[PDB]
């Protein structure tokens, strides 16, 4: 497909099983094993797959890979080899799905090494760094609110709590493939729209809308339409 000039997604349903299948094959061949018993060819076998997934003048293949951590040990050779090839990590958590927020992506543990001023530009970098700093602070103030209560919380600290609940809800979105669950038509949000929306809430324009005006809405221009009737 890429040679046709398209841009392509390759989904790998467990890169850990690619690694173990290589361990099984090399043991049946009877090569000498390596640390933790993996094949001696482990790093080249990962490299042979991962280096074909790149962007050529013609077009590119991009890959989304499910990862498994053999003992929740992040130092084990299979994770350690895989992590050297990943550009981004997306963490899905059941705790966020309990809030009914979907997609259930944890914004604090998900990362990308493209998220840098020289790659995404300063506006994006400052916006995402802003959201991360606010959601980190809110997760601190949730301890104070729980152990001591809202009376303890200052009028500036109440403002970050009020904004973090709005930010957290505005991360939700209805998918075209999910319509049978939500009963709302799916939305596609361009990068400039999402940066402008989160930049909005952080600069304190849109401060006055109800927090449910942001949930499942779309972009921020649709949140002002939702608030007019909610």
């Amino acid at each position: 497909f890429r040679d046709e000039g398209r841009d392509v997604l390759l989904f790998v349903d467990n890169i850990y099983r690619y690694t173990l299948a290589g361990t099984e094959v090399s043991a049946l061949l009877g090569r000498m094993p390596s640390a933790v018993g993996y094949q001696p060819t482990l790093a080249e076998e990962m490299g042979v797959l991962q280096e074909r997934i790149t962007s050529t003048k013609t077009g590119s293949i991009t890959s989304v890979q499910a990862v498994y951590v053999p003992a929740d040990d992040l130092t084990d050779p299979s994770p350690a080899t895989t992590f050297a090839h990943l550009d981004a990590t997306v963490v899905l958590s059941r705790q966020i799905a309990s809030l009914g927020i979907y997609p259930a992506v944890d914004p604090l543990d998900s990362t990308s090494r493209q998220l840098d001023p020289l790659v995404v530009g300063q506006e994006h970098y400052d916006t995402a760094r802003g959201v991360q700093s606010i959601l980190q602070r809110y997760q601190e103030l949730k301890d104070i609110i729980a152990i001591l209560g809202m009376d303890e919380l200052s009028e500036e600290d109440k403002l970050v709590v009020a904004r973090a609940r709005k930010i957290q809800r505005f991360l939700s979105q209805p998918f075209f493939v999910a319509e049978v669950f939500t009963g709302s038509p799916g939305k596609y949000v361009s990068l400039k729209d999402t940066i402008r929306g989160f930049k909005g809430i952080m600069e304190g324009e849109y401060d006055h809308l109800p927090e449910q005006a942001f949930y499942m809405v779309g972009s921020i221009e649709e949140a002002v339409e939702k608030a007019k009737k909610l």
Partner: protein, 85 residues
Amino acid sequence: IIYDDLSKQAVAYRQISLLLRRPPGREAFPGDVFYLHSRLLERAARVNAEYVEAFTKGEVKGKTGSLTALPIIETQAGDVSAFVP
């Protein structure tokens, strides 16, 4: 179907493999020890009506069939990180 101590089946297959001088893997189990349990457990399945109709040459038409498997594994000491487990 209940398979009691599939960990005992893996110990038997290890003995056969080492006496047959086939190369060892981790915890001395042979290389294809995953293939032993995986091909066994994948047979436990529910099959659609058109498979049953084809297999029986149409003498049974409206029914699905199934095999449900309850394998047992014994963790030596609360370790679920062993090889066979």
